[PDB]
């Protein structure tokens, strides 16, 4: 028997993603797909400065290619997902009746 | 405001490979055309 009519209000949440938000402009991001593969915490930088061709002094110099190294940070974000046992036992057995 | 939204990529970039295109020496025309492509791209912006 339809006894009473109750109204509840769930909360709409603006779910965000890293590409959807705006600070992904700053970071050219990749999908490296397994971070155990890189085995050195430093990364070599090949900085190549160009040259300006002076003529009066006749004092030529090549492009003074100098190479420095910089570290690679790593982070570890973790959370929990709370799935119920009965819903997984429902999901394991495919039903056929409506 | 100059706008209200910006066009950005829908997915992360993937790592592409470059260098081990191990096709054989096709002809003299292929190596000459690629040499002209690599050297005449110095003075050409488009």
């Amino acid at each position: 028997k339809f006894e009473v009519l109750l109204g509840v209000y769930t909360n709409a949440i603006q779910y965000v993603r890293f590409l959807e938000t705006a600070l992904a402009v700053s970071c050219v991001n990749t999908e490296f797909k397994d971070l155990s593969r890189m085995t050195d915490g430093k990364i070599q930088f090949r900085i190549s400065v160009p040259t300006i061709a002076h003529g009066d002094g006749r004092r030529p110099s090549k492009q003074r290619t100098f190479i420095v190294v910089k570290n690679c940070h790593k982070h570890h974000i973790s959370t929990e997902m709370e799935l119920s046992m009965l819903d997984l036992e429902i999901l394991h057995s495919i039903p056929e009746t409506p | 405001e100059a706008d209200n939204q910006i066009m950005g990529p829908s997915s992360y970039a993937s790592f592409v490979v470059r260098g081990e295109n191990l096709v054989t020496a096709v002809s003299y025309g292929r190596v000459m055309r690629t040499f002209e492509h690599f050297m005449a791209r110095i003075v050409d912006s488009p």
């Binding site: 050219v28 990749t30 085995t39 050195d40 990364i43 070599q44 | 970039a13 993937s14 790592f15 592409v16 490979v17 470059r18 260098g19 081990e20």
Partner: peptide, 23 residues
């Protein structure tokens, strides 16, 4: 360093199909 004795075969570009720089 770490590249003091190894040969490099190819590279892995960050989607730079026409650019050669980047990472």
């Amino acid at each position: 360093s770490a590249a003091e004795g190894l040969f490099h075969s190819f590279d892995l570009l960050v989607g730079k199909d026409a650019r050669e720089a980047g990472i």
